[PDB]
């Protein structure tokens, strides 16, 4: 994995020694070359995971998250170079350094062979994200949002540190490859109940769980666009990745410890979709949609069937691409009307027809239109939760109805109807904006052709 | 002050610390603490204003009371052991009194009530000496007497220090009081792991001295004693805001920084001895320390507070201060976590 | 640096260069007292170094290439716009007065640094001990608010206490009508808008506060508009003073060493000029401060430390 | 009054000074070369060559091997009358049960 860590570190002298008009182009070009190179991780096998060294490995779960992570950096550089155009050159290089450094932390977060290295990288991903939100966020609430983002994650993760060091003292190792063969059953006791909570609540905060999601519609809203892209596309999926690793160790106690959290997520996907029906902020509507989509991934990890893991990793990749594109569409209107109020700019299909086509396709992937991998992940989670209990089909179907409702309500509100008369700075769509939309959508549609590379370790 | 007299008095401070660190006799331990206090009193009164005289008087009363309780513990040891070797104490009453005396010398809670007053009353260099160098000798004595330290006493002092140093810094806007309550919380972290593994105690003390030396050196180089005076640093020297950002993020215990190293090793050595509740409550309590550190980063580096007009004149002048070892201390306080197994050199 | 504690140890004591000619002299008077030529002639008879009165661009004269900067980088204030609209809305009055107080403080630090490093005396014009007469005149004329006077008194209280007062204060009695005659014969179209009550308040604060409070801590000399024309009578009065007042007598090598360590670090001299009292006449918001600071960096010879600018011709940087 | 602050700057239009703006920069040559870098290295390289690369993965996670091996095993144990799969994954001879 060192052949990806070293070029990501070499993006730092590439962004600090570049000419002052070349610091976006060079980082975009070489991060696209790293994203091209990311496809060598598809050397996967049906029995063995691609095990590089004592420190790094990549199974078929970490590999799509890695390719999505290394693909997200040039798109964040494209999205964030217009509103940081008038920035100081040094602060612009600091923003690009925080993006590169967050990618550097993530690509060795997902490949961490040993779990405390995963914890160090996992909590290292707070610091560039916190700096991006609280420094290049736009409104006043970015400082409070950075507080909530920091102090939910550390409140969840500092019991996780004690849990992992306890496993290190008991099993003798936190290597995940050794713990695939030295895993012992975790019986019913109060000690093992709080063991389960300490191993799971950090990732429940990072997904986010319903009831603990209150960091998210302030951190995802008050960030800039690159912060919103990385938070929606990768940093929620760190939680699901950690769950799919750490639920190896939590059996059979998960089979009754999962019930309150399965209730919280099965009811939170209804409640947050209902919240999306009544949002005035478009960016907050996309934030609560992200909570609504990650609730299904939480249920799919907690029921731990193979169909549920396949649907959960497919839905994680699909939601990363879809939510990143929805935030970029929201930014493309915010850079014209300078307001996140959804009812302000109306009738935009009369003005921006191809951008409205991108709105249509992202709203169709948001409502899980087949054969998109959105529908593949959605559908496999619904199959596995039906096999779990036959009455969960009511909640899954009601969630799908409300999901279609807020997706097409977002589309109709922003794009349809009579246009707003007093708004006259609606520029045509720039080539940068349409290129950003297509670089989100076209991989998301091409992955419907060959979807087996995003279905996890147990496809 | 005469620079010759300044150098001799700082050598006498260091001499008292070294006499505590090398000597095998309890009278020489007590002599070293006496010499240390007697020499550090002029450093606190370097500027001769009533707050420094008040701070030196409060420091004198606390360290004098602790030195007399130390000599009473030594005298009860001479009763119940007939000898003077600096090793374990042969009576639980002598052990209790000596642990109280060293808790007063360190300013651990509930003997903490002098540390923010005395640190506020004195300059930044003397506050640096008080919060870094004056922690060395009592931790050396605690390192030597640990076969007789009562566990419940030292852990009560430790968690009470961590909790009160967490809640104390949340109300503060003066930088020296923030550093003093940071001191109280970190001394709780040091003494909590002492009877479990004192090598991790020395690791916490070394990382703490590096980070506190970095923060006091940045506060000296910017001449900022309050939060709101530190807030003008972005319009004067913007690199200093970056350095105080990464050092405050380090002292909060965030990975991948080296201020995460001591608390992670302390949790690591306390779970080995079947203590789970205590390092978890200590780790959750350190989030308060991280909260007022993030308050300072918000006021300094992540936002731009309003400055005044006269800063334009200070743009035309460089820093002619001897920012001694400030890049070295900034690198060591942040980028040392890949070198975490270097701690074995303190074994 | 150049001078530190080590040079004090190795023999550089400052009373070895402190002769009887080493005196700090400050010449004072109203707006057109004509005391500039008096200060220059006193400085050339006594063999001293004359410092002109610090304006807006004094720091520009001591740093960089010595040429004045644009007013957006230095001052952000105008003496002419104070003369024209002394009750202006944008707060030019106290902002000009505060920048001038910092300029005179920088000048006084330069004066003490010259006096203590060379042993040559200094003649000054309207030092920081007399700067407050324009503050009190502008407050009595309603040109500034009371909170501006409170801000000035805070900055002065924490800055002027760290210095020694001058040896000789030379005040020049020029009445208001003669001052206005010289203003009208000067021909400055902005300066001819000065009201009589402002000049009267200057003279009143002078004669009622400055000289009665400086007469204890220093030796005041006082002259009319014609007996100050003869420079030799003034220099004769200076040379036959029995210097016995003020805190210059109890100054050994250690106190003057601490003072010389103070007056060479200019950011410590100018430390408390920008105290964080958010007074709206001098508080510059973050976007304007950021933009003006980034434009000040782009000025030639200002991007780095003074020895480290290739664009003005500094070589051997890779070995510095 | 309130303090000394710059007014809100008007939001710039990239199409006023450059009607051929691709939206990357206000310098037109930098803008066109950013357009070409983005379009070439994203679409012409990563999308096209990655669709080809994923399209021709060498038996990704050995599913085609497993189908061919299963055809071989079914073709074996149909000809010998063996059942196509045992309900026991492991041989019961090599399993010691806990006695009762």
């Amino acid at each position: 994995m060192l052949k990806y860590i070293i070029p990501t570190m070499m993006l730092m002298p590439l962004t600090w020694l570049s000419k002052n008009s070349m610091i976006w182009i060079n980082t975009t070009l070489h991060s696209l070359l790293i994203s091209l190179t990311s496809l060598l991780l598809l050397n996967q096998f049906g029995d063995n995971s691609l095990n590089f060294s004592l420190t790094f490995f990549s199974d078929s779960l970490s590999t799509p998250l890695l390719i999505l992570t290394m693909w997200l950096l040039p798109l964040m550089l494209m999205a964030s170079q217009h509103h940081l155009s008038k920035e100081n050159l040094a602060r612009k290089k600091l923003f690009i350094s925080m993006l590169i450094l967050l990618q550097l932390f993530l690509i060795m977060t997902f490949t961490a062979t040993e779990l405390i290295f995963f914890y160090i990288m996992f909590e290292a991903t707070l610091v560039p994200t916190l700096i991006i939100i609280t420094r290049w966020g736009n409104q006043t609430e970015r400082l409070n949002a950075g507080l909530y983002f920091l102090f939910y994650t550390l409140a969840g993760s500092l019991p996780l540190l004690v849990a992992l060091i306890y496993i290190q003292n008991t099993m003798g190792s936190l290597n995940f490859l050794i713990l695939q063969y030295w895993v012992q059953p975790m019986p019913n006791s109060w000690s093992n109940t709080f063991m389960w909570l300490a191993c799971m609540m950090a990732f429940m905060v990072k997904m986010p769980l319903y009831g603990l999601h209150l960091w998210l519609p302030k951190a995802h809203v008050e960030a800039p666009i690159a912060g919103s892209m990385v938070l929606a596309a990768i940093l929620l999926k760190l939680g699901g990745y950690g769950m799919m690793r750490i639920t190896l160790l939590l059996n059979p106690i998960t089979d009754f410890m999962a019930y309150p959290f399965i209730m919280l997520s099965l009811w939170g996907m209804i409640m947050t979709s209902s919240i999306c029906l009544r949002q005035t902020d478009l960016k907050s509507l996309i934030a609560y949609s992200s909570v609504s989509h990650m609730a299904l991934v939480i249920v799919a990890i907690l029921i731990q069937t193979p169909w549920s893991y396949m649907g959960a990793t497919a839905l994680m990749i699909a939601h990363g691409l879809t939510s990143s594109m929805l935030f970029c569409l929201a930014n493309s209107n915010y850079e014209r009307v300078h307001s996140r109020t959804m009812i302000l700019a109306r009738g935009l299909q009369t003005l921006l027809p191809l951008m409205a086509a991108w709105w249509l396709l992202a709203s169709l992937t948001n409502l899980a239109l087949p054969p998109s991998i959105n529908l593949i992940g959605e559908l496999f989670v619904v199959m596995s939760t039906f096999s779990w209990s036959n009455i969960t089909i009511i909640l899954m179907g009601l969630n799908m109805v409300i999901t279609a409702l807020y997706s097409l309500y977002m589309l109709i509100t922003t794009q349809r109807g009579k246009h707003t008369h007093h708004i006259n700075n609606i520029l045509p769509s720039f080539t940068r904006e349409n290129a950003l939309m297509s670089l989100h959508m076209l991989p998301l549609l091409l992955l419907s052709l060959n979807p087996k590379i995003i279905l996890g370790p147990l496809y | 002050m005469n620079p010759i007299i300044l150098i001799i008095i700082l050598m006498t401070v260091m001499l008292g610390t070294i006499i505590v660190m090398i000597s095998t006799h309890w009278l020489l331990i007590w002599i070293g603490f006496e010499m240390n206090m007697l020499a550090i009193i002029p450093i606190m009164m370097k500027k001769h204003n009533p707050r420094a005289t008040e701070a030196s008087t409060k420091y004198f009363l606390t360290q004098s009371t602790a030195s007399m309780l130390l000599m009473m513990a030594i005298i009860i040891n001479l009763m119940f052991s007939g000898q003077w070797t600096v090793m374990k104490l042969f009576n639980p009453m002598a052990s209790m009194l000596m642990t109280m005396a060293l808790a007063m010398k360190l300013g651990m809670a509930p003997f903490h009530f002098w540390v923010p007053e005395v640190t506020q009353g004195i300059p930044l260099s003397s506050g640096l000496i008080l919060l870094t160098w004056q922690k060395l000798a009592p931790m050396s004595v605690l390192y030597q007497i640990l076969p007789s330290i009562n566990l419940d006493l030292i852990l009560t002092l430790s968690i009470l220090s961590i909790t009160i140093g967490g809640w104390g810094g949340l109300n503060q806007t003066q930088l020296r009081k923030i550093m003093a309550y940071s001191s109280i919380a970190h001394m709780g972290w040091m003494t909590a792991v002492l009877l479990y593994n004192p090598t991790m105690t020395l690791l916490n003390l070394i990382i703490y001295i590096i980070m506190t030396s970095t923060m006091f050196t940045l506060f000296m180089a910017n001449s900022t004693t309050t939060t709101l005076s530190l807030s003008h640093t972005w319009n004067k020297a913007p690199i200093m805001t970056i350095l105080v950002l990464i050092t405050l993020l380090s002292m909060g215990g965030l990975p991948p920084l080296s201020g995460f190293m001591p608390k992670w090793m302390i949790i690591q050595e306390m779970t080995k001895n079947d203590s789970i509740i205590l390092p978890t409550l200590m780790a959750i309590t350190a989030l308060l320390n991280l909260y007022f550190y993030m308050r300072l980063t918000y006021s300094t580096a992540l936002t731009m507070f309003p400055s005044t007009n006269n800063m334009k004149m200070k743009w035309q002048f460089p820093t002619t201060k001897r920012m001694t070892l400030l890049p070295t201390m900034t690198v060591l306080s942040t980028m040392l976590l890949p070198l975490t197994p270097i701690l074995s050199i303190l074994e | 640096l150049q001078y530190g504690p080590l040079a004090y140890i190795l023999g550089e004591k400052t009373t070895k260069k402190m002769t009887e000619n080493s005196k700090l002299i400050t010449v004072d008077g109203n707006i057109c007292s004509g005391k500039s030529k008096l200060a220059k002639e006193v400085a050339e008879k006594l063999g001293l170094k004359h410092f002109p009165e610090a304006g807006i661009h004094y720091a520009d004269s001591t740093t960089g290439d010595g040429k004045p900067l644009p007013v957006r980088f230095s001052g952000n204030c105008s003496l002419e716009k104070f003369y024209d609209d002394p009750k202006s809305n944008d707060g030019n009055s106290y902002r000009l007065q505060a920048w001038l107080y910092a300029s005179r403080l920088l000048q006084y630090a330069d004066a003490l640094e010259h006096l203590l490093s060379t042993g040559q005396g200094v003649v000054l014009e309207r030092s920081i001990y007399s700067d407050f007469v324009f503050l009190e005149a502008m407050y009595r004329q309603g040109f500034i608010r009371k909170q501006c006077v409170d801000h000035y008194n805070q900055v002065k209280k924490v800055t002027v206490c760290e210095y020694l007062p001058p040896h000789v204060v030379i005040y020049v009695d020029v009445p208001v009508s003669e001052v206005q005659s010289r203003i009208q014969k000067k021909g400055n179209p902005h300066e001819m808008k000065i009201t009589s009550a402002y000049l009267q308040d200057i003279e009143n604060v002078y004669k009622g506060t400055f000289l009665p409070e400086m007469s204890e801590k220093c030796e005041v000399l006082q002259y009319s508009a014609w007996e100050a024309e003869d420079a030799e009578k003034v220099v004769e009065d200076i040379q036959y003073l029995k210097y016995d007042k003020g805190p210059w007598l109890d100054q050994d090598d250690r106190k003057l060493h601490n003072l010389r360590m103070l007056v060479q670090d200019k950011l410590e001299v100018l430390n408390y000029t920008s105290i964080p009292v958010f007074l709206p006449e001098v508080t510059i918001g973050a976007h304007q401060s950021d933009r003006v600071f980034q434009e000040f960096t782009e000025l030639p010879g200002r991007k780095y430390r003074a020895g480290y600018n290739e664009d003005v011709g500094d070589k051997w940087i890779w070995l510095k | 009054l309130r303090w000394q602050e710059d007014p809100e700057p008007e939001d710039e239009n990239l199409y006023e000074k450059n009607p051929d703006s691709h939206g990357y920069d206000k310098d037109p040559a930098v803008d066109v070369w950013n357009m070409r870098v983005v379009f070439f290295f994203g679409f012409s390289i990563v999308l096209v060559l990655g669709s080809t690369f994923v399209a021709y993965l060498p038996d990704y996670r050995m599913q085609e091997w497993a189908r061919r091996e299963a055809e071989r095993l079914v073709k074996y144990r149909e000809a010998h009358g063996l059942p196509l799969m045992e309900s026991n994954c492991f041989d019961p001879s090599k399993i010691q049960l806990p006695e009762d």
């Binding site: 290049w136 970015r142 | 806007t173 709101l228 507070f305 | 958010f278 918001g285 | 809100e8």
Partner: peptide, 19 residues
């Protein structure tokens, strides 16, 4: 439409004797 930076009312919250 530009980035919010703290005003005088925000920064007077950090200017007291305590917080």
């Amino acid at each position: 439409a530009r980035q919010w930076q703290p005003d005088v009312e925000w920064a007077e919250q950090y200017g007291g004797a305590v917080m």
